mmCIF file of all heavy atoms in Angstrom:
data_model
loop_
_atom_site.group_PDB
_atom_site.id
_atom_site.type_symbol
_atom_site.label_atom_id
_atom_site.label_comp_id
_atom_site.label_asym_id
_atom_site.label_seq_id
_atom_site.Cartn_x
_atom_site.Cartn_y
_atom_site.Cartn_z
ATOM 1 N N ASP I 19 -2.029 19.034 11.704
ATOM 2 C CA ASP I 19 -0.644 19.184 11.266
ATOM 3 C C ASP I 19 -0.500 19.143 9.761
ATOM 4 O O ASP I 19 0.454 19.663 9.226
ATOM 5 C CB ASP I 19 0.226 18.036 11.867
ATOM 6 C CG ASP I 19 0.524 18.290 13.354
ATOM 7 O OD1 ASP I 19 0.929 19.311 13.791
ATOM 8 O OD2 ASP I 19 0.369 17.267 14.078
ATOM 9 N N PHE I 20 -1.465 18.461 9.128
ATOM 10 C CA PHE I 20 -1.386 18.309 7.657
ATOM 11 C C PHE I 20 -2.735 18.657 7.124
ATOM 12 O O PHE I 20 -3.588 17.733 6.881
ATOM 13 C CB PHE I 20 -1.015 16.881 7.282
ATOM 14 C CG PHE I 20 0.236 16.424 7.929
ATOM 15 C CD1 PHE I 20 0.213 15.716 9.068
ATOM 16 C CD2 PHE I 20 1.486 16.635 7.342
ATOM 17 C CE1 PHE I 20 1.396 15.274 9.709
ATOM 18 C CE2 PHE I 20 2.643 16.257 7.922
ATOM 19 C CZ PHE I 20 2.569 15.582 9.164
ATOM 20 N N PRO I 21 -2.966 19.919 6.803
ATOM 21 C CA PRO I 21 -4.300 20.432 6.384
ATOM 22 C C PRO I 21 -4.772 19.713 5.068
ATOM 23 O O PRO I 21 -5.915 19.750 4.801
ATOM 24 C CB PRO I 21 -4.093 21.903 6.184
ATOM 25 C CG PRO I 21 -2.804 22.233 6.840
ATOM 26 C CD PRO I 21 -1.935 21.005 6.900
ATOM 27 N N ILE I 22 -3.811 19.173 4.266
ATOM 28 C CA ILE I 22 -4.262 18.500 3.013
ATOM 29 C C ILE I 22 -5.040 17.232 3.348
ATOM 30 O O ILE I 22 -5.604 16.623 2.430
ATOM 31 C CB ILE I 22 -2.974 18.177 2.151
ATOM 32 C CG1 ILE I 22 -3.390 17.805 0.778
ATOM 33 C CG2 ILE I 22 -2.167 17.088 2.783
ATOM 34 C CD1 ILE I 22 -3.751 18.991 -0.100
ATOM 35 N N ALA I 23 -5.144 16.904 4.581
ATOM 36 C CA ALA I 23 -5.957 15.751 5.051
ATOM 37 C C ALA I 23 -7.453 15.947 4.580
ATOM 38 O O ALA I 23 -8.173 14.961 4.286
ATOM 39 C CB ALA I 23 -5.869 15.471 6.511
ATOM 40 N N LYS I 24 -7.928 17.190 4.484
ATOM 41 C CA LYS I 24 -9.240 17.392 4.036
ATOM 42 C C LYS I 24 -9.291 17.851 2.606
ATOM 43 O O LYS I 24 -10.137 18.564 2.134
ATOM 44 C CB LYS I 24 -9.898 18.485 4.913
ATOM 45 C CG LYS I 24 -9.939 18.146 6.339
ATOM 46 C CD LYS I 24 -10.644 19.252 7.178
ATOM 47 C CE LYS I 24 -10.621 18.995 8.692
ATOM 48 N NZ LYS I 24 -11.443 17.806 9.036
ATOM 49 N N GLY I 25 -8.254 17.417 1.854
ATOM 50 C CA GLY I 25 -8.102 17.726 0.442
ATOM 51 C C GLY I 25 -9.130 17.146 -0.465
ATOM 52 O O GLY I 25 -10.033 16.332 -0.070
ATOM 53 N N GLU I 26 -9.071 17.513 -1.763
ATOM 54 C CA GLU I 26 -9.933 17.067 -2.787
ATOM 55 C C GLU I 26 -9.663 15.622 -3.374
ATOM 56 O O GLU I 26 -10.434 15.173 -4.153
ATOM 57 C CB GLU I 26 -10.009 18.077 -3.943
ATOM 58 C CG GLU I 26 -10.471 19.406 -3.506
ATOM 59 C CD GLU I 26 -11.913 19.383 -2.999
ATOM 60 O OE1 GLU I 26 -12.770 19.098 -3.746
ATOM 61 O OE2 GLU I 26 -12.081 19.631 -1.801
ATOM 62 N N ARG I 27 -8.499 15.125 -3.061
ATOM 63 C CA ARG I 27 -8.261 13.792 -3.668
ATOM 64 C C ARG I 27 -7.465 12.951 -2.687
ATOM 65 O O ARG I 27 -6.302 12.528 -2.919
ATOM 66 C CB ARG I 27 -7.655 13.830 -5.016
ATOM 67 C CG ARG I 27 -6.282 14.553 -5.174
ATOM 68 C CD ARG I 27 -5.698 14.425 -6.570
ATOM 69 N NE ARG I 27 -4.756 13.337 -6.651
ATOM 70 C CZ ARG I 27 -3.935 13.176 -7.699
ATOM 71 N NH1 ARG I 27 -3.886 13.997 -8.751
ATOM 72 N NH2 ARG I 27 -3.111 12.083 -7.682
ATOM 73 N N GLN I 28 -8.093 12.736 -1.498
ATOM 74 C CA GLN I 28 -7.525 11.919 -0.495
ATOM 75 C C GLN I 28 -7.828 10.449 -0.651
ATOM 76 O O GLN I 28 -8.805 10.129 -1.306
ATOM 77 C CB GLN I 28 -8.005 12.453 0.838
ATOM 78 C CG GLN I 28 -7.365 13.810 1.238
ATOM 79 C CD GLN I 28 -5.889 13.727 1.502
ATOM 80 O OE1 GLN I 28 -5.476 13.085 2.521
ATOM 81 N NE2 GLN I 28 -5.089 14.212 0.610
ATOM 82 N N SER I 29 -7.008 9.617 -0.103
ATOM 83 C CA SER I 29 -7.115 8.156 -0.175
ATOM 84 C C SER I 29 -7.060 7.562 1.304
ATOM 85 O O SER I 29 -6.392 8.158 2.140
ATOM 86 C CB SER I 29 -5.963 7.580 -0.969
ATOM 87 O OG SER I 29 -6.154 7.948 -2.322
ATOM 88 N N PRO I 30 -7.629 6.385 1.552
ATOM 89 C CA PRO I 30 -8.291 5.585 0.558
ATOM 90 C C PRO I 30 -9.791 5.983 0.322
ATOM 91 O O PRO I 30 -10.290 6.934 0.972
ATOM 92 C CB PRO I 30 -8.283 4.228 1.218
ATOM 93 C CG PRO I 30 -8.472 4.569 2.705
ATOM 94 C CD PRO I 30 -7.590 5.798 2.871
ATOM 95 N N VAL I 31 -10.449 5.266 -0.503
ATOM 96 C CA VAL I 31 -11.888 5.536 -0.823
ATOM 97 C C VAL I 31 -12.624 4.169 -0.888
ATOM 98 O O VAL I 31 -12.002 3.088 -0.996
ATOM 99 C CB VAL I 31 -12.081 6.256 -2.109
ATOM 100 C CG1 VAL I 31 -11.299 7.650 -2.088
ATOM 101 C CG2 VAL I 31 -11.648 5.430 -3.305
ATOM 102 N N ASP I 32 -13.899 4.261 -0.826
ATOM 103 C CA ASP I 32 -14.728 3.112 -1.110
ATOM 104 C C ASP I 32 -14.914 2.952 -2.615
ATOM 105 O O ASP I 32 -15.123 3.971 -3.304
ATOM 106 C CB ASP I 32 -16.098 3.239 -0.440
ATOM 107 C CG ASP I 32 -16.948 2.019 -0.704
ATOM 108 O OD1 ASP I 32 -16.523 0.851 -0.548
ATOM 109 O OD2 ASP I 32 -18.139 2.210 -1.114
ATOM 110 N N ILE I 33 -14.736 1.742 -3.127
ATOM 111 C CA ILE I 33 -14.953 1.533 -4.471
ATOM 112 C C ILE I 33 -16.356 0.955 -4.685
ATOM 113 O O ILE I 33 -16.627 -0.251 -4.294
ATOM 114 C CB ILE I 33 -13.874 0.523 -5.052
ATOM 115 C CG1 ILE I 33 -12.483 1.106 -4.935
ATOM 116 C CG2 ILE I 33 -14.171 0.277 -6.486
ATOM 117 C CD1 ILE I 33 -11.352 0.136 -5.207
ATOM 118 N N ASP I 34 -17.248 1.739 -5.217
ATOM 119 C CA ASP I 34 -18.584 1.363 -5.479
ATOM 120 C C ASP I 34 -18.697 0.745 -6.894
ATOM 121 O O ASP I 34 -18.653 1.570 -7.874
ATOM 122 C CB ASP I 34 -19.572 2.532 -5.326
ATOM 123 C CG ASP I 34 -20.964 2.154 -5.479
ATOM 124 O OD1 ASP I 34 -21.654 1.677 -4.509
ATOM 125 O OD2 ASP I 34 -21.598 2.276 -6.527
#
Side-chain angles (χ1 to χ4, degrees):
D19 285 314
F20 305 94
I22 195 76
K24 301 180 187 291
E26 298 296 297
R27 59 176 265 191
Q28 288 291 291
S29 290
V31 303
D32 182 46
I33 297 168
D34 186 81

